[PDB]
Amino acid sequence: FTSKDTYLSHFNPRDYLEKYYSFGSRHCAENEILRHLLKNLFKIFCLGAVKGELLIDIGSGPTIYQLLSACESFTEIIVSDYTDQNLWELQKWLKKEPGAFDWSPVVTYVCDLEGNRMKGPEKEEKLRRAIKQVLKCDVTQSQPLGGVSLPPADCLLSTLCLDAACPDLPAYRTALRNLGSLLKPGGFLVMVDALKSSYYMIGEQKFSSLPLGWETVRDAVEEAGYTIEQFEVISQNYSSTTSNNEGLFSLVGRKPG
Numbered sequence: 001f002t003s004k005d006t007y008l009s010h011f012n013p014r015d016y017l018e019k020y021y022s023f024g025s026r027h028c029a030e031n032e033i034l035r036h037l038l039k040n041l042f043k044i045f046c047l048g049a050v051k052g053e054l055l056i057d058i059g060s061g062p063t064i065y066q067l068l069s070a071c072e073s074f075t076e077i078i079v080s081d082y083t084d085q086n087l088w089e090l091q092k093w094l095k096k097e098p099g100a101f102d103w104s105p106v107v108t109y110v111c112d113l114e115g116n117r118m119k120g121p122e123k124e125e126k127l128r129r130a131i132k133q134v135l136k137c138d139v140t141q142s143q144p145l146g147g148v149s150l151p152p153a154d155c156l157l158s159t160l161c162l163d164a165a166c167p168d169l170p171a172y173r174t175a176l177r178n179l180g181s182l183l184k185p186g187g188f189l190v191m192v193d194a195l196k197s198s199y200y201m202i203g204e205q206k207f208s209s210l211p212l213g214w215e216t217v218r219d220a221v222e223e224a225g226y227t228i229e230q231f232e233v234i235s236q237n238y239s240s241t242t243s244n245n246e247g248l249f250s251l252v253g254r255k256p257g
C-alpha cells in the first residue's frame with residue numbers, strides 16, 4: 001500500500017533509529033528483537049561458511065547493526081537504500097560527522113556476542129573501512145542499483161526491507177529475482193524480515209508491510225530461484241504500538257552454480 005515515494009517524504013531516519021535501535025530502558029520489545037537479530041546474524045556470518053569478498057546490503061535504511069558481524073567475513077561492503085535521507089544518515093556515521101547516530105550500545109553488545117576479543121572502536125573502524133560505496137537502490141527495478149558497474153557480489157544482505165517494499169507476493173518474488181542479478185552463481189542471500197506483519201509505525205507514521213508466514217517465505221525464496229541453507233523463526237513481537245507482526249525469520253539462501 002505505502003508507495004515508495006511516501007518513503008522519500010515521510011520516512012524519518014532519526015525517529016526510526018530512536019524507536020527501533022536506541023537500546024534504552026524504554027522500547028523493551030524492540031530491544032529484545034534487536035538482541036535476537038544480532039545473535040542470529042552473529043551465527044550466520046561468524047559461525048559458518050558465509051564468507052567472501054563483496055557483500056551488498058539492500059535497503060540498509062539508516063542502520064549499520066546488520067553489518068557488525070558481516071564485516072568480520074566480508075572485506076568489502078556496499079550499503080544501499082531507496083531513501084536519500086537514510087543514505088545521508090549512514091554517510092554521517094561513516095564519516096564520523098556531528099549528528100551521526102550513536103551505535104555505541106549496539107557495537108558493545110556485538111563485541112560481547114563475539115567473545116570480547118575486540119573493543120568497540122576497533123569494530124567500528126573495521127566496518128567504516130569496509131564500506132566501499134553508499135548507493136541508491138530500488139528493489140522493484142530490473143537493475144536494482146541503477147546499473148552502477150559492479151562485479152558479481154559474493155553475498156546479498158537484506159534486513160526488514162522486502163516486506164516493506166513489496167505490495168504482494170508476485171512483487172516479492174520479482175524483487176528477489178531482481179536482486180539475484182547482482183549475485184554471483186554460488187553466492188549467498190541472507191535475509192531477515194517480520195512474519196505476518198501488515199504495518200509498522202514510526203511515531204505517528206504508519207508504513208505498510210507484506211504479511212507472510214514462514215512456509216510462504218521459504219516457498220517464495222525457493223521459487224525466486226534460491227536454495228535454502230539455514231532458516232530460523234524468531235518468537236518475538238514488536239510493541240503493540242509498533243507493529244502487528246507474529247515473529248520474524250532469518251534465512252540463508254544460495255544462488256545455484
Ligand SMILES: Nc1ncnc2c1ncn2[C@@H]1O[C@H](CSCC[C@H](N)C(=O)O)[C@@H](O)[C@H]1O
Nearest residue numbers: 059060061082083138139159160161164165
Ligand atoms: N522499493 C524499495 N527499494 C529499496 N529499498 C526500499 C524500497 N522501499 C522501501 N525501502 C527501504 O526499506 C527500508 C525499511 S526499514 C528497514 C531498514 C534496515 N535494513 C533495518 O534492518 O532496520 C527503508 O529504509 C526504506 O527506505
